Amino acid sequence: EFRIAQDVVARENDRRASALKEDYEALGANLARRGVDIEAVTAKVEKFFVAVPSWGVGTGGTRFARFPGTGEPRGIFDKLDDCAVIQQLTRATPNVSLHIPWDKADPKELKARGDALGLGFDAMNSNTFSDAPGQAHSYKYGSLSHTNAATRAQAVEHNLECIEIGKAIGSKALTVWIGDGSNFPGQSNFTRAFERYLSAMAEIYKGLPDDWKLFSEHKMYEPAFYSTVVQDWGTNYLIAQTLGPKAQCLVDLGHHAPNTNIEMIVARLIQFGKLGGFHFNDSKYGDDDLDAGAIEPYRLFLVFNELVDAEARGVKGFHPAHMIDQFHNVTDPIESLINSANEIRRAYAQALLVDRAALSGYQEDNDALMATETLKRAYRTDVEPILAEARRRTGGAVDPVATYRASGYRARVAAERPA
Amino acid sequence: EFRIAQDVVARENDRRASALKEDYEALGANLARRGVDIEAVTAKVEKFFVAVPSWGVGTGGTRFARFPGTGEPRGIFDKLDDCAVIQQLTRATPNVSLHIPWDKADPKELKARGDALGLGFDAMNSNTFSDAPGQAHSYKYGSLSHTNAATRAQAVEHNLECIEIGKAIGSKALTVWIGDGSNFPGQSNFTRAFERYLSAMAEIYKGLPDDWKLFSEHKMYEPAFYSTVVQDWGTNYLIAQTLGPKAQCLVDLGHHAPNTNIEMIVARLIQFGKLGGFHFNDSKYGDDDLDAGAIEPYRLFLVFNELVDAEARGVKGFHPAHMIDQFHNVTDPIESLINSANEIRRAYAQALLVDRAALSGYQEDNDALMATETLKRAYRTDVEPILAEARRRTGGAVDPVATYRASGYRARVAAERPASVAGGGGIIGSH
Amino acid sequence: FRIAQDVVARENDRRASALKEDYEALGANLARRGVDIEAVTAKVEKFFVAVPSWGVGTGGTRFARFPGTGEPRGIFDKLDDCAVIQQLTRATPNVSLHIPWDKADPKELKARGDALGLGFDAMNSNTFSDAPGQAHSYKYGSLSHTNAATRAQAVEHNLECIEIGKAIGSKALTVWIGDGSNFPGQSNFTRAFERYLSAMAEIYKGLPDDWKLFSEHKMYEPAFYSTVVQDWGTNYLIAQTLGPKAQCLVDLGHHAPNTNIEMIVARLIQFGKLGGFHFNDSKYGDDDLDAGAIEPYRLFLVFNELVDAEARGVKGFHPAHMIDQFHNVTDPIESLINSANEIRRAYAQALLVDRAALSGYQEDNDALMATETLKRAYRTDVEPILAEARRRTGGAVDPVATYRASGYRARVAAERPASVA
Amino acid sequence: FRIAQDVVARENDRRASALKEDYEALGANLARRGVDIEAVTAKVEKFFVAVPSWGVGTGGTRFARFPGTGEPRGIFDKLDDCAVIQQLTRATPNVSLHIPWDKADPKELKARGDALGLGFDAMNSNTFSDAPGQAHSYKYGSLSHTNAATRAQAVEHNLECIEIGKAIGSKALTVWIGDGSNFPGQSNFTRAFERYLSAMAEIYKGLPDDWKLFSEHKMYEPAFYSTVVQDWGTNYLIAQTLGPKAQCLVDLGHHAPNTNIEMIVARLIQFGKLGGFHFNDSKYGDDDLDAGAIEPYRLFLVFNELVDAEARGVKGFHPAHMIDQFHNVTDPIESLINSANEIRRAYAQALLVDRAALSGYQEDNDALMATETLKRAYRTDVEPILAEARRRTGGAVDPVATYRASGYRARVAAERPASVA
Ligand SMILES: O=C[C@H](O)[C@H](O)[C@H](O)[C@H](O)CO
Ligand SMILES: O=C[C@H](O)[C@H](O)[C@H](O)[C@H](O)CO
Ligand SMILES: O=C[C@H](O)[C@H](O)[C@H](O)[C@H](O)CO
Ligand SMILES: O=C[C@H](O)[C@H](O)[C@H](O)[C@H](O)CO
Ligand SMILES: [Mn+2]
Ligand SMILES: [Mn+2]
Ligand SMILES: [Mn+2]
Ligand SMILES: [Mn+2]
Ligand SMILES: [Mn+2]
Ligand SMILES: [Mn+2]
Ligand SMILES: [Mn+2]
Ligand SMILES: [Mn+2]
């Protein structure tokens, strides 16, 4: 089934086909003069996938308010239908990230809907940073690191349930992000809290299938405003190293202190084999969870530069998980996810254009200016024609958001769904 | 009316009177050696008041979750009852700050309950950063600076209603904090948005009584994550100067960029006569809204140092409004407000101990070390005995939280009020 | 000609074919977008930014300085080097002087400038360091020092800078001082600012009718607790207090972490106090790195506000543009060349913004399309436009490549003695 | 004695009565709290922190250095001044040397230290600046430089520092380098770190059985884009990789804005890699201001983690303590005196925390009482304990007052020639 009528996709592609041909051929000639085969780049770009978050499909909110738009998804099934639109038009988001209990539903039904829509499932996400109705023990003062044994046990069991749901739908990983921490000096004993966390995570690790990975996600602050148990990549590395080979670190771009060199953290984790994956988004102040690349596109490119360099250095067994983790408070969630996925492919494509041999030479000779200009020559390249052609060749739309709007999809679901 | 049994207050005071007498006399002797009359300090401290936020007595939350405790107040009336406890025990929070529509209710009843509890009302707070039921125009894309004229008009009318409510209960000011801004480059035209804001505030200004003040509150970010119309004190100054004499700037401690020298902003606003008031709280990362002085007590003292210096060089008319703006997510709201008000008086008392003449000399002589040590000599002084004696002498508790717990108030209201339920913070819609 | 014309010609010819292909391709793409590439190029070739005399020599940090070869022996050598930057980029016809670093006979400075085809931008005073023979030290301040005689001395220095500027063609004085405190209590914030305002008022009295006085704010460094002119708010208060000739200068790296700098630019323009800019890039503090080398989009967003001002018809808006950078690990000339290029790049992209479309998206609160409208311009590779602008004005298609081909650095290395003490 | 004993005696007697009153009052208050003031004073008397040789001279920024009178020139003058700090505070018996700044015949250094009653803490290498005659420049790095010969030179320098330390009684080497990049792409993050680790392994091989090797992380400066040893995470990787003798040194001002530094301390302790501390205070960057002059509570919270670690009986816990500050606008000796005092103040307050009560409030999630339990200790004015500790051990009740009364500064000013009168 197609959420967007194929005739609309075809019409909107034909409408822009002439211009795309001109732009693609021009870029192809330019890249040829630079010793690059545009076809090789396009081939790789159409193979780059990033998971879409179920929680990014509906309108998000801040601690002050939430302003829903029309046709808001009523539950996970509406969310999957909307995710199908993003994948159909961008062809870059074949998999969806589920969050439990937000997306709790019959696993078999979720799988059935996914297969029918042509969607798979990425890492499962547990939730012990909020209480559900009728919950025995509250996570107000923590979960996996709570001082109360029964509360930690409940948190561990919840994570095990997430694994069971994931096994039924085809997921192969569990991502653990908790709000555990303190808001006041002295409230928590830093070391004892971390010890409790490690012990609880060891229980989750024990119940982790051998064909699964366990990702821990660090965050400097929020909801905890003084200290956070898994506060940065250093603590995260200690966690992954302690737990075992199936445990790795997940880097969410907006979870770092002001001015942090995030691409270096990425490089360090790769060198020590603990880069499990990414949570892409952009930010300017805190964990803003904005559309990827909308604020600092160069930083996104620099992160991908490290990923491509890893392949160039010959790093083996490196297949980091890629996922978008964003909240859309003032835009149509589907449109934001579409352009965010596009931006991630944009940064990747540009990273593929870097002349690695030239860069290596400038690095060895300490020619800082030419080294940085070598990266800029790739980053400054407008790869939109490659992204558009990749989409066109794989069943997507030349201009995804334009096609989405032309389809009238939002108005359609607005009529099918309550206000 | 006394929310806390007088016999309990008396009992818990007597239990700690002996120790307090010893500490107070010891501190008195120490201050005497330093040429300071402890009685003069205590007299000033017992007269220092800070407004308590009605939204502070209810458990707060983040965008991820809210974890209510027992005996959560149902509405403004329950909140007033709880605020009465803070005032009774600390004697430092006689006035309450209301937020509309959260606390909307019959002005006559609000005023009636306040008088019965011995509580007054500080500045009113308007709310155009969220949508209420039946609202004609959404504030999703802004309010006072929204591109849509009808939306700005609705926001203006709401603020005027806040003034009308305040006039009936004894309030003398309106604080305006909005979330207006953008999450993406290009979404808003910075200049046009600010022009719209200024025009809307001018309409609100026209509705201000002669003895009223209009306080605009700046904030770097949140809910807007790229730009905010009233983003810092610079824009705030432009607003206040543009609007008129009754318009001033409100400084919320947790609303500034990392590493900002906040006490300097305070001094600058005082110098140009635009320091409307404060929203006290503490923080480490963003607008954390934590208990005042719980993270950076020296910074709080340094802010008070600027205020007391002004109070010293006689900046007449200068009467900034002091208010606590905090959210309590992991403590009993009443206890946190009690200790926060205490910490504010602590910083004030220490600022009063500064040898101004000595400091001035070291400043003129560029003796940086002795100048800083002159501030430290005041700040290092443990003024707790003064704070406790001030409370005891005015009908309060030597140890407020201790007396609060001994009274069993929380368990009391917990049995009178309906049970609460924990949930999310609205990060996503129902599912 | 600092750089042999035959070298510039040879290197331009070597790259002519590719430039033609790229420029024509971009022109067709822009035409499809309703933009005339020729109109953009014509404006870009007229965008100028002042080159700092202090940026031509290798810079350093408080830990160390690592000079390269052929370091300039003073202002005359510095002007010669600035001439290279202008000849190759054609985007830096004016030089920013700093006194007393560049103190010399005004007549000689003017003669060298004219001979090289260079003019002079705003003068920069220096009361953040002590020069020989000073009766008073600036250790504890200058224009805001507690000692009246010290303030008077700093005022006289600034007036001297104005005299030098008048003689060479300058029309403005930029004042940046380190005045502040390193400890709470050391300074009375208000009295220190009042002293500063009194001293600046005196300097203001010495301004010719057609001169401007620019005050430059900075959050910290050299002062590590408080700084008198710490941010744009205090800066606005200064400009408004002094008069119409006084405006604020915004140095990109002088703001608190995460500050929305482009908004500050918009605010100052709205109130007629945006005197000018000090361009550079940074990641941590006032790093003074090559413009756009760290955050190119931010640079574009600043230019977006500048171009919007013109779009809104702001009257009498002629902000000064200057590069303020230090080059610690690169050939200073090469870094200034590429920095000037990046500045023109961001400017060119700002010119490409479809503001008619943007205005509509802003009115309808279509945040996604509004931001995509800016991105469509920013994502455009305008290098062909910058290169063609250089070709037509006597510059080099690839400035740094031509610079290296000329062997200039090796040449001056043999002519200039390296300091030995 | 640098300071005449009669002066120390006179200035102590002048303040003896007030100290007695305050000490007895605090003793009674602590008694009511179940604490023996005598036990606290005994512990405070034994808490030592190393004084930096580079701290007694006036510091500066990249903009300027404003020396005071009697500036110590050379390590011998510096040791004489360090002796004053130890005599008056009795809290700084050991000095931290920096090579080559303090290079001198080891026998003479040792002899001078012994004569002044001073020992030597960890040695500090310098490959972040170039020395005269140096074969390879550190402009682009040292231990992680791309050039093998440059890395070898850096390694040899560090080995030389170990040799000097062995001769004077030092038992550790602290390695802080500026290695990094100012531009994206300039360095390959991974390869640079691999080179650093290989170089450090060579240095590790030259460590005596009873020596420690401390690596010091820093977010930025001198490198403004990336730094090889940028944070505690990389630092942990270094220490774990090198071996049991390698640990991490935490300099308070070397972290990103808002970082929870006390947590980093706890984490390193838990994994046995907390080598030591570089105490100072800051507000913006690596300001290197007097300890506790900006954020005294943070300093106390760091000490709370140290005292807790000992209370828990953690193994491998025995950190070195050193002051790493620069004094740009004060008498260096006075600042070091009061900074050492502030460090002992924070330590003393940490000793007052009721650990049993705190543990209970933590287990029961009583956040308010847990934080108040820390505040009860922090709010306690321990000055009487610090003063009594000094008085009982040969120091001064009020160190700075005694220092000024002695006229020491004027004395060395008369013995040491300044650049200009
Ligand atoms: O801040 C929360 C983290 O980004 C987590 O990944 C979280 O589970 C996700 O954002 C959903 O709220
Ligand atoms: O961030 C919001 C500001 O602090 C306002 O004062 C607000 O109205 C208050 O915090 C209640 O949410
Ligand atoms: O930080 C100093 C400012 O950028 C000034 O413009 C200064 O005069 C210039 O950088 C030269 O040092
Ligand atoms: O920033 C430099 C580090 O703090 C090092 O410890 C350094 O060796 C010391 O500060 C002396 O410069
Ligand atoms: Mn995430
Ligand atoms: Mn997040
Ligand atoms: Mn507030
Ligand atoms: Mn707030
Ligand atoms: Mn500048
Ligand atoms: Mn600067
Ligand atoms: Mn250090
Ligand atoms: Mn340092």
Q: Which of A252, A255, A280, A322 to mutate to test the pocket of ligand 1 (most atoms within 8 A of CB)?
A: A252
Distance of alpha carbon B346 from alpha carbon B352, whole angstroms: 10
Q: How wide is the angle at C-alpha D334 spanned by C-alphas D332 and D340, nearest 5°? A: 100
CA distances from C274 to A111, A277, C288, C339 (A): 59, 45, 21, 22
* Dihedral sign (CA D95, D99, D105, D106): positive
> Is the Cβ–Cβ distance between C208 and D47 less than 8 Å?
no
Q: What is the CA radius of gyration of chain B?
A: 22
Instruction: Name B357's Cβ contacts closer than 8 Å, sequence gap at least 6.
Output: none
Distance of alpha carbon D277 from alpha carbon B408, whole angstroms: 46
Q: Which ligand is nearest to the CA of C124?
A: 3
Give me the half-sphere count of Cα atoms (radius 13 Å) on the Cβ side of residue D92.
33
What's chain C's length in residues?
421
Q: Which of C176, C248, C339 to mutate to test the pocket of ligand 3 (most atoms within 8 A of CB)?
A: C176
User: Ligand 9 (ion): which residues have CB within 5 A?
Assistant: C 251, 278, 324
Q: Which residue has the tokens 């455009």?
A: C380
CATH fold for domain C1-421 = TIM Barrel (3.20.20)
A125 within ligand 1 shell (Cβ under 6 A):
yes
How close B127 gets to chain A, by Cα (Å)? 10
Closest CA to ligand 1's atom 9: A325
Partner-chain contact C183 B371, CB within 8 Å: yes
* Dihedral sign (CA C200, C203, C209, C214): negative
| Interface with A, mutate which of B126, B188, B428 (most A CBs under 10 A) | B428
For the stretch D22-42, what's the b/e string if a residue is b when 16 or more beta carbons lie within 10 angstroms of its beta carbon? bbebbbebbeeeebebeebbe
Strands D246-251 and B227-228: unpaired
Q: What is the CA radius of gyration of chain A?
A: 22
Instruction: Name A333's Cβ contacts closer than 8 Å, sequence gap at least 6.
Output: A56, A57, A58, A59, A60, A69, A82
According to DSSP, residue A55 is labeled: G
D86 in the Ramachandran plot: left (φ > 0), alpha (ψ -120 to 50) or beta?
alpha
- Cβ contacts of A131 on chain B, cutoff 8 Å: 65, 67, 422-423
- Cβ contacts of A26 on chain C, cutoff 8 Å: 25, 28-29
SS (H, E, C) chain B: CCCCCHHHHHHHHHHHHHHHHHHHHHHHHHHHHCCCCHHHHHHHHCCCCCEEEHHHCCCCECCCCECCCCCCCCCHHHHHHHHHHHHHHHCCCCEEECECCCCCCCHHHHHHHHHHHCCEECCEECCCCCCCCCCCCCCCCCCCCCCCHHHHHHHHHHHHHHHHHHHHHCCCEEEECCCCEECCCCCCCHHHHHHHHHHHHHHHHCCCCCCCEEEEECCCCCCCCCEECCCCHHHHHHHHHHHCCCEEEEEEHHHCCCCCCHHHHHHHHHHCCCEEEEEECECCCCCCCECCCCCCHHHHHHHHHHHHHHHHCCCCCCCCEEEECCCCCCCCHHHHHHHHHHHHHHHHHHHHHCCHHHHHHHHHCCCHHHHHHHHHHHHCCCCHHHHHHHHHHCCCCCCHHHHHHHHCHHHHHHHHCCCCCCECCCCCCCC
Q: Which residue has the tokens 């900002």?
A: B260
Q: Which ligand is nearest to the CA of D63?
A: 3
A26, A13, A196: which is closest to A88 by C-alpha?
A13
Q: How was this structure determined?
A: X-ray
Which subunits sit against D, judged by 3+ Cβ pairs under 8 A? A, B, C
Q: What is the resolution of this structure in A?
A: 1.5
Amino acid identity for residue C257 in this structure = P
Closest CA to ligand 2's atom 3: B177
Strand order across the B95-97 sheet: B52-53, B95-97, B120-121
Distance of alpha carbon C383 from alpha carbon C388, whole angstroms: 9
CA C303 from chain centre, in angstroms, equals 13
Distance of alpha carbon B321 from alpha carbon C258, whole angstroms: 29
Distance of alpha carbon A150 from alpha carbon A137, whole angstroms: 8
CA distances from D14 to C234, D3, D5, D9, D383 (A): 46, 17, 14, 9, 17
Q: Is C216 among the annotated ligand-binding positions?
A: yes
* Dihedral sign (CA D106, D108, D111, D116): negative
> Residue A111: is it exposed, middle or buried by C-beta count within 10 angstroms (0-12/13-18/19+)?
middle
Nearest CB to A372 within list D184, D193, D232? D184
Amino acid identity for residue C230 in this structure = Q
Q: What is the CA radius of gyration of chain D?
A: 22
D217 within ligand 4 shell (Cβ under 6 A):
no
Nearest CB to C338 within list A285, A369, A381? A369
Q: Which of A52, A177, A250 to mutate to test the pocket of ligand 1 (most atoms within 8 A of CB)?
A: A177
Distance of alpha carbon B155 from alpha carbon B140, whole angstroms: 12
D168, D167, D246: which is closest to D204 by C-alpha?
D246
> Is the Cβ–Cβ distance between C69 and C417 less than 8 Å?
no
According to DSSP, residue D182 is labeled: S
How close A368 gets to chain C, by Cα (Å)? 7
Q: At A95, give phi and psi (nearest 5°).
A: -120, 150
> Is the Cβ–Cβ distance between D274 and D248 less than 8 Å?
yes
For residue D266, what are its two tokens? 């706890």
C70, C65, C56: which is closest to C101 by C-alpha?
C56
CA C153 from chain centre, in angstroms, equals 27
Strands D180-181 and D226-227: antiparallel
Question: Can you say which residues of B are annotated as belonging to the binding site?
Answer: 217, 252, 255, 279, 287, 289, 296, 325
Cis-peptide, bond into residue B258, ω within 30° of zero: no
> Residue A6: is it exposed, middle or buried by C-beta count within 10 angstroms (0-12/13-18/19+)?
exposed
Q: A406 touching C, CB under 8 A?
A: no
Q: Which of B97, B159, B252, B278 to mutate to test the pocket of ligand 2 (most atoms within 8 A of CB)?
A: B252
Instruction: Name D227's Cβ contacts closer than 8 Å, sequence gap at least 6.
Output: A261, D178, D179, D180, D218, D219, D220
Helix (H, G, I), strand (E, B) or coil at D218: coil
Q: How far is the CA of D334 from the centre of ligand 6 (A)?
A: 46
Q: D18 touching B, CB under 8 A?
A: yes
Q: B21 touching D, CB under 8 A?
A: no
Nearest CB to C32 within list A19, A261, A284? A19
CA distances from C248 to B153, C29, C251 (A): 35, 39, 10
Distance of alpha carbon A92 from alpha carbon A51, whole angstroms: 8
Chain B 282-311, residues with CB within 8 Å of chain C CB atoms: 298, 302, 305-306, 309
DSSP per position, C95-143: EEEETTTT---HHHHHHHHHHHT-EEEEEE---SSPPTT-SS--TT-ST
Cis-peptide, bond into residue C100, ω within 30° of zero: yes
D54 within ligand 4 shell (Cβ under 6 A):
yes
Q: Which ligand is nearest to the CA of D124?
A: 4
Q: At C67, give phi and psi (nearest 5°).
A: -60, 150
Distance of alpha carbon C326 from alpha carbon D63, whole angstroms: 12
Distance of alpha carbon C257 from alpha carbon C266, whole angstroms: 19
Q: Which residue has the tokens 């955050």?
A: C295
Strands A213-217 and A173-176: parallel
For residue C265, what are its two tokens? 């630019």
Q: How many other CB atoms sit within 10 Å of the CB of residue C113? A: 21
Q: Which CATH architecture has domain A1-419?
A: Alpha-Beta Barrel (3.20)
Q: How many other CB atoms sit within 10 Å of the CB of residue A380? A: 17
> Is the Cβ–Cβ distance between D284 and C254 less than 8 Å?
no
Return the percent helix, strand and coil in chain A, to nearest 5.
50, 10, 40
Q: D330 touching B, CB under 8 A?
A: yes
Helix (H, G, I), strand (E, B) or coil at A273: coil
Identify the CATH class of B1-431. alpha beta
Instruction: Name C211's Cβ contacts closer than 8 Å, sequence gap at least 6.
Output: C162, C165, C171, C172, C173, C245
- Cβ contacts of C290 on chain A, cutoff 8 Å: 369, 372
Q: C17 touching B, CB under 8 A?
A: no
Give me the half-sphere count of Cα atoms (radius 13 Å) on the Cβ side of residue D142.
25
CA D375 from chain centre, in angstroms, equals 25
CA distances from C277 to C96, C246, C248, C323 (A): 12, 14, 9, 8
Chain B 214-243, residues with CB within 8 Å of chain A CB atoms: 220-223, 225-226
Partner-chain contact C284 D63, CB within 8 Å: no
Nearest CB to A129 within list B64, B138, B426? B64
Distance of alpha carbon B272 from alpha carbon B237, whole angstroms: 9
C305, A223, D318, C373: which is closest to B329 by C-alpha?
A223
For residue D24, what are its two tokens? 């007895």
- Cβ contacts of A355 on chain D, cutoff 8 Å: none
> Residue A68: is it exposed, middle or buried by C-beta count within 10 angstroms (0-12/13-18/19+)?
middle
Distance of alpha carbon A158 from alpha carbon A128, whole angstroms: 8
Q: How far is the CA of A63 from the centre of ligand 7 (A)?
A: 14
D227 within ligand 4 shell (Cβ under 6 A):
no
Chain C 247-286, residues with CB within 8 Å of chain B CB atoms: 255-260, 262-264, 266-267, 269-271
Distance of alpha carbon C260 from alpha carbon A357, whole angstroms: 38
Question: Can you say which residues of B are annotated as belonging to the binding site for Zn(2+)?
Answer: 217, 252, 255, 279, 287, 289, 325
Distance of alpha carbon A394 from alpha carbon A93, whole angstroms: 12
> Residue C68: is it exposed, middle or buried by C-beta count within 10 angstroms (0-12/13-18/19+)?
middle
- Cβ contacts of B336 on chain D, cutoff 8 Å: 368
- Cβ contacts of C60 on chain D, cutoff 8 Å: 62
> Residue A356: is it exposed, middle or buried by C-beta count within 10 angstroms (0-12/13-18/19+)?
middle
> Is the Cβ–Cβ distance between A227 and A181 less than 8 Å?
yes
Closest CA to ligand 4's atom 5: D176
Helix (H, G, I), strand (E, B) or coil at D409: helix
How close C45 gets to chain A, by Cα (Å)? 20
D287 within ligand 4 shell (Cβ under 6 A):
no
Closest-approach residue (CA) in chain A for C336 = A369
- Cβ contacts of B65 on chain A, cutoff 8 Å: 129-131, 139, 179, 223
Distance of alpha carbon B280 from alpha carbon B290, whole angstroms: 9
